Amino acid sequence: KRVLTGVTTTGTPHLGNYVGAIRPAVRAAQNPDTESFLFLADYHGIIKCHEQEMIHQSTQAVAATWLACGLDPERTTFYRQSDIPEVMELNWILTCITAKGLMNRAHAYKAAVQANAENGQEDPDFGVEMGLFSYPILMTADILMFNANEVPVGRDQIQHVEMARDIAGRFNHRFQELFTLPEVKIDENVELLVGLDGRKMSKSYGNTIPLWENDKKTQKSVNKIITNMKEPGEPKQPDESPLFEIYKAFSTPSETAEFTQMLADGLAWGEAKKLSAAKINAELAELRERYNALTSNPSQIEEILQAGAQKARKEARELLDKVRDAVGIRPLK
């Protein structure tokens, strides 16, 4: 039972990525009944992003984040997409059996087209580059290259797996059945983490809390959460500030219940914010020490990534030779 996930290397992870993705995934990859695959989608980074060191810095920070949070490379095959040349070969092969209409309907592309039309732009493809048009095929290669059974994705990403199933089927039928049809994996128990202003925490919203900061900075961050004008003795209900959902994401059911009655008995916001930052700090204190260790010694991350690549390519090449033979690429004998 092979479980496979791609993560972007396009920025530095925040608390929201920790609660909603990283922390659940690290726990979930400990199941001995699954084989665990996680890669950095660094070649997806050049689809749109362009800053010189953005990919390299986000790669180092995303790799250090997952490591610092307990991702075990002895358990998880952990690698950069840019260290698997087989994926790029597979990407061309799948391109040859993918219908253009499938890419016409890819959501990211439909959004670029509608945004031109929302902006009075009568050319639907204005500004569209082929990375945006074709990345669903590369994502399919990322998955099929290792014949993943389950691909843990958000709701947002469900189309992308359904597209891989579509391409896998068409390859299987045109050539031969080499690709298992991958399956979405969704956990309806991960609460997405709210930001400082009530909305879901997201880099594009400017409502994020950094994941890797010292206590005093984590405190100053927490002190920006929207509160209300209730008095240090006034009854505070939990639905009144995002602070409560923040405290909740870092506390047992019992502690949050205690926090509720604490608020209900008239805990001031300054103390509440103070307690929330401490919970966050307490959960993160050790991880933050490992993150600083790794980011200060990146060659340790590079070693781990090379060992991952070595493991990944061995299984990539086993499948690719089958695929190469199925599409007619064969030695002269």
Ligand X SMILES: N[C@@H](Cc1c[nH]c2ccccc12)C(=O)O
Q: Is 330 exposed, middle or buried (0-12, 13-18, 19+ CB in 10 A)?
A: exposed
Phi, then psi, of 210 in degrees rounded to 5:
-60, 150
The minimum distance between CB 179 and ligand X, in angstroms, equals 14
Q: Does 9 bind ligand X (CB under 6 A)?
A: no
Interface region with ligand X, contact rule CB under 6 A, candidates 19-27, 86-94, 149-157, 322-330: 149-157
Q: How far is CA 75 from CA 182, 282, 302, in A?
A: 21, 26, 17
Q: Does 142 bind ligand X (CB under 6 A)?
A: yes
End-to-end CA distance of the chain: 37
- The half-sphere exposure of 263 on its side-chain side, counting CA atoms within 13 A, is 24
CB 277 within 8 Å of CB 251: no
Interface region with ligand X, contact rule CB under 6 A, candidates 2-10, 45-53, 242-250, 254-262: 2-10
Interface region with ligand X, contact rule CB under 6 A, candidates 3-11, 54-62, 219-227, 240-248: 3-11
Q: Does 5 bind ligand X (CB under 6 A)?
A: yes
| H or E element at residue 35 | strand 35-40
Q: Does 6 bind ligand X (CB under 6 A)?
A: yes
CB 168 within 8 Å of CB 157: no
Q: Does 87 bind ligand X (CB under 6 A)?
A: no
> Applying CB under 6 A, which of residues 84, 87, 93, 143 lies at the interface with ligand X?
143
Chain positions contacting ligand X, by CB under 6 A: 5-6, 8, 41, 44, 139, 142-143, 151, 153, 157
Annotated binding site for L-tryptophan, which residues? 142
Annotated binding site for ATP, which residues? 8-10, 16-17, 154-156, 193, 200-204
